[PDB]
Amino acid sequence: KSPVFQFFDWVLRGTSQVMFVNNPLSGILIILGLFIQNPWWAISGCLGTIMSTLTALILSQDKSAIAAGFHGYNGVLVGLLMAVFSDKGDYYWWLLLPVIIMSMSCPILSSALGTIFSKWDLPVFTLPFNITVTLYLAATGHYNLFFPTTLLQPASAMPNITWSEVQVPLLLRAIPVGIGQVYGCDNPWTGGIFLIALFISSPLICLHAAIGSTMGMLAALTIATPFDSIYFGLCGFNSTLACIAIGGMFYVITWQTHLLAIACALFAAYLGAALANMLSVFGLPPCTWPFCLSALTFLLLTTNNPAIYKLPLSKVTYPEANRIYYLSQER
C-alpha cells in the first residue's frame, strides 16, 4: 500500500509493544486510552513514537525489526513521562522540542545495548527509555528555567498508617490502575482498555499482567507502603511488566515457569521500593528500572530442570505460539 500507511502501521505496532504485544488494533486501543487520560500526554507520546521510529529510518537499520515496532515503543514512553513530570501544566508546546531531540537517542541506545546483550541472547527491554528519561530529568530537574520537573524528595518522617481506614474495593481497583500506570495513566478506564487491548492479542499475557499487578499491589502492603500510593497503581506497574516478560513471552509457559513469573513479579515489586527511595535523593522517579533489572536477572538464571526453557530471541512472538513452536520442535 501507500508508504505513509506503512509508517503508521509501524507506529501503531510500536505503540502497543510496551506490553510485548504486536497488533495495530491493540495500539489503536492504547492510543484511545491515552486520549481519555490526558489529550496532551497522548499527543506528546505519539510525537515521541513518530520521532523514535523515524530516527531508526535515518540510521538505516534493519527493516524487519521496524515493522514489528521494536524501535517505536521506547519513544511513546519518553513522551508520556516527559509530559507527566512537567510543572508547566497541560499544552505547554515548548516541551515538544526536548521530546523531538531526546527521542532521537532511543534508537541509538537500542542499537548500542543490543550489541552488548547479543553475547547472552537477552532482549533489550526498556533500558534506552530508562537511560534517556533519567538523563533528561537529571539534566533539567525541578529548578530549571525552561522545563522544570515536579518536586520529588526522599522521606524523613514516619508515615501514619491507619488499618481501620483502608477500603477493600479501591484496593482491588489498583489492579486496573496498576496496569494502566505502565504508560503513566492513573484512570481506571485506561487500565481497563489496556486489559482489552492485551486480551484481544493473547489472553495469557492479560492473565499474567493482571496477576503481576495483584502481586505488586500486595507486595507493598508487606512493607507498610502508604495507601495513597497503592491506590494510584505506582507500586504494581513494574511487577506487571516483569510477570508478563517472565510468564510466557521469553520462557515457555509451564506451572513452574508460572511460579517463576510470580517470584519475578514479587522481586520486581520489592526492588521498586528500593529504587524509588534511592533515586528519590536525586529528585528522580523510578521509571521501569526495577522491571529491567528483575527481568534480566531472571532471564540469566540457569537451571537443570528440563521444563524451564529459555526461548531464543529469534523465535519469540507470543506465549501460545511459543507453546505451539516448542511442542512442534520437540516432536
Interface residue list for its own copies (CB under 8 A): 59-62, 101-102, 105, 108-109, 111-116, 119-120, 134-136, 138-141, 143-147, 155-159, 161, 222-224, 266-267, 270-271, 273-275, 277-278, 281-282, 284, 296-298, 300-305
Name the minimum Å distance from CB 75 to its own copies: 16
8-state DSSP, 312: P
Our CB check for its own copies shows the closer of 108 and 200 to be 108
Question: What proportions of the chain, in percent to the nearest 5, are helix, strand and coil?
Answer: 65, 0, 30
Rounded alpha-carbon distances, angstroms, from residue 298 to 23, 242, 251, 306: 27, 9, 10, 17
Per-residue HEC secondary structure of 25-46 comes to: HHHHHHHHHHHHHCHHHHHHHH
Closest CA to 312 of 47, 102, 123: 123
- d(Cα 275, Cα 284) in Å, to the nearest integer? 10
Name the minimum Å distance from CB 166 to its own copies: 14
Please name the residue that has the C-alpha cell 510543572: 87
Our CB check for its own copies shows the closer of 53 and 202 to be 53
- d(Cα 295, Cα 312) in Å, to the nearest integer? 15
Our CB check for its own copies shows the closer of 16 and 52 to be 52
Our CB check for its own copies shows the closer of 91 and 282 to be 282
Name the minimum Å distance from CB 303 to its own copies: 6
Name the minimum Å distance from CB 304 to its own copies: 5
Name the minimum Å distance from CB 100 to its own copies: 12
Q: What is the DSSP string of 54-99?
A: HHHHHTT--SHHHHS-TTTHHHHHHHHHHHHTBSS-S--GGGHHHH
- d(Cα 219, Cα 265) in Å, to the nearest integer? 9
Rounded alpha-carbon distances, angstroms, from residue 316 to 201, 238, 311, 330: 15, 21, 7, 16
Name the minimum Å distance from CB 297 to its own copies: 4
Our CB check for its own copies shows the closer of 81 and 266 to be 266
Our CB check for its own copies shows the closer of 126 and 202 to be 126
Q: Give the Cβ contact number of residue 156 at 10 Å.
A: 5
Name the minimum Å distance from CB 111 to its own copies: 5
Our CB check for its own copies shows the closer of 36 and 278 to be 278
Our CB check for its own copies shows the closer of 32 and 223 to be 223
Name the minimum Å distance from CB 288 to its own copies: 17
CB of 121 closer than 8 Å to CB of 130: no
